[PDB]
Design a protein around this ligand. Structure first.
Ligand SMILES: OC[C@H]1O[C@H](O[C@H]2[C@H](O)[C@@H](O)[C@@H](O)O[C@@H]2CO)[C@H](O)[C@@H](O)[C@@H]1O
Length: 513
């Protein structure tokens, strides 16, 4: 059996027909599935080893999967490589290696109802007036999915703005383009459409799709996969170039639908045969495309056959003014960061400026999975517990209460920051005094109530500790007091003294409250 995952918006029935052919020829069963959140679930089920043999997604997520060792390197021969456009192979190259088979090029277009709107607008700026005109006639101008930053980026980034800077053949993770003048202008325009009742912040994919396909709204923004359902609605639609904002073309991300092979699959050779000899042929792509259109397919023979379609021409025109999605592992963080900014800006939970400031920071912030070792933070953090570590740069925002990972010599420890540079700190029995006054420690509540002896921390003062000023209990510059929540068993600053700023490598996020 080959198990294949593909997103619910794609032609999974058509893909299944190709599966039936393969079964008929080989005796091997092919099961196509379209679970929710498959792009998040894939690494989860790979960790167990009950994942799909083949996973379809846009190329952006595959860098992250490869970096985690979840994907097999693919080994097409010259003759097969030559069948696909070289730029499609570029999209599935990660650290020198091919990690997926490219299937098709996707970009969003403006889709409009010709009976409601014979002349689609050239500019985003026209849409408010157009909506007023249509509101008078019982309709609206535009509905598209506002929940996913894929759909809102074309406007957001039209006037400037990018994910990661690409230069001299590689992405710079340190150069994020979310908090800049262009994106502020675009996101502000988007928020103002909502503010002014031209769109609704709750509008998602199914709401927008239903509304356009029942003739309630004049325009939507979607990809080629959406065309089949519009064909079935008998709406008279056109697919055209996205409007300009401030005279600048919209900047959709360009995705390449790609198929990766699970590194843990026991059917890698069969997966290769299915993709190369059954799917990526004129016959196989037609089956999927007839179910839900693929876009500009990676296979030259069949792309040439479909290129006559004005809707494909429109797709690629929008793609020419777009931004190829980066495939670096950090893209996941970028998407989540931008998703949050738009929702918060659109709901008013943040101003556009707060939204983009945070998103700029979070898109570039490196987060590393970590597993807790031992009992010294028990029960706050348990042995074996999975946490997230936000890597802190050299001399870059630590506060009391932060739980941190730090080094000394191959040694790493997890402890809580109890005092930072400048803090006066001391313990009398189990009572913590910080800058003269008592500080509560709710994270010790359990261990205080279940203590073996008289006291779990016990009396001490900063002055008496290694690396402190013997003169004062005021923590010196660039130094930190760190203690384990499991005070009865923790080897911490009470044993090895104050630690240095340069020792701290990350801040720990974990399950709490
Ligand atoms: O919204 C963030 C999301 O964008 C892209 O996902 C697209 C996908 O490429 C399209 O094929 C279509 O299915 O819509 C998706 C957006 O809902 C990225 O490929 C994805 O990783 C990212 O989370």
């Amino acid at each position: 059996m080959l198990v294949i995952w593909i997103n619910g918006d794609k032609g999974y029935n058509g893909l299944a027909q190709v599966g039936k052919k393969f079964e008929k020829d080989t005796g091997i069963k092919v099961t196509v599935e379209h679970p929710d959140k498959l792009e998040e679930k894939f690494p989860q089920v790979a960790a167990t080893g009950d994942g799909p043999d083949i996973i379809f997604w846009a190329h952006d997520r595959f860098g992250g999967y490869a970096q985690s060792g979840l994907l097999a390197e693919i080994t097409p021969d010259k003759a097969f490589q030559d069948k696909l456009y070289p730029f499609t192979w570029d999209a599935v190259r990660y650290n020198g290696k091919l990690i997926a088979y490219p299937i098709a090029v996707e970009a969003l277009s403006l889709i409009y109802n010709k009976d409601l709107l014979p002349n689609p607008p050239k500019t985003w700026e026209e849409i408010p007036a157009l909506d007023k005109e249509l509101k008078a006639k019982g309709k609206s101008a535009l509905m598209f999915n506002l929940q996913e930053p894929y759909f809102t980026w074309p406007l957001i980034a039209a006037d400037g703005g990018y994910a990661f800077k690409y230069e001299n053949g590689k992405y710079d993770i340190k150069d994020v383009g979310v908090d800049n003048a262009g994106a502020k202008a675009g996101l502000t325009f988007l928020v103002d459409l909502i503010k002014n009742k031209h769109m609704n912040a709750d509008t998602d994919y199914s709401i927008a799709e239903a509304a356009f396909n029942k003739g309630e709204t004049a325009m939507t923004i979607n990809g080629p996969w959406a065309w089949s359902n519009i064909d079935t609605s008998k709406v008279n639609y056109g697919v055209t170039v996205l409007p300009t904002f401030k005279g600048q073309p919209s900047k959709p991300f360009v995705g390449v639908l790609s198929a990766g092979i699970n590194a843990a699959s026991p059917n890698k050779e069969l997966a290769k045969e299915f993709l190369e000899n059954y799917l990526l042929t004129d016959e196989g792509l037609e089956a999927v495309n007839k179910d839900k259109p693929l876009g500009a397919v990676a296979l030259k023979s069949y792309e040439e056959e479909l290129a006559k379609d004005p809707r494909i021409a429109a797709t690629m025109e929008n793609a020419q003014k777009g931004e190829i999605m980066p495939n670096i592992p950090q893209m996941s963080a970028f998407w989540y960061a931008v998703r949050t900014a738009v929702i918060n800006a659109a709901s008013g939970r943040q101003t556009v400026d707060e939204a983009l400031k945070d998103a700029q920071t979070n898109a570039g912030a490196i987060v590393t999975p970590y597993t807790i070792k031992g009992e010294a933070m028990d029960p706050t953090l348990k042995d074996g517990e999975r946490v997230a570590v936000n890597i802190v740069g050299y001399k870059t925002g630590l506060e009391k209460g932060n739980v941190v990972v730090f080094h000394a010599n191959n040694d790493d420890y997890v402890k809580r920051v109890i005092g930072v540079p400048g803090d006066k700190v001391e313990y009398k029995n189990d009572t913590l005094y910080v800058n003269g006054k008592k500080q509560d420690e709710p994270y010790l509540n359990y261990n205080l109530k279940h203590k073996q002896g008289d006291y779990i921390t016990g009396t001490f003062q900063v002055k008496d500790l290694p690396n402190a000023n013997p003169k004062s209990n005021v923590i010196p510059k660039g130094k930190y007091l760190v203690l384990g929540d499991n005070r009865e068993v923790s080897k911490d600053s009470r044993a090895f003294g104050l630690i240095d700023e340069d020792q701290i490598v990350g801040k720990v996020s974990f399950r709490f409250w």
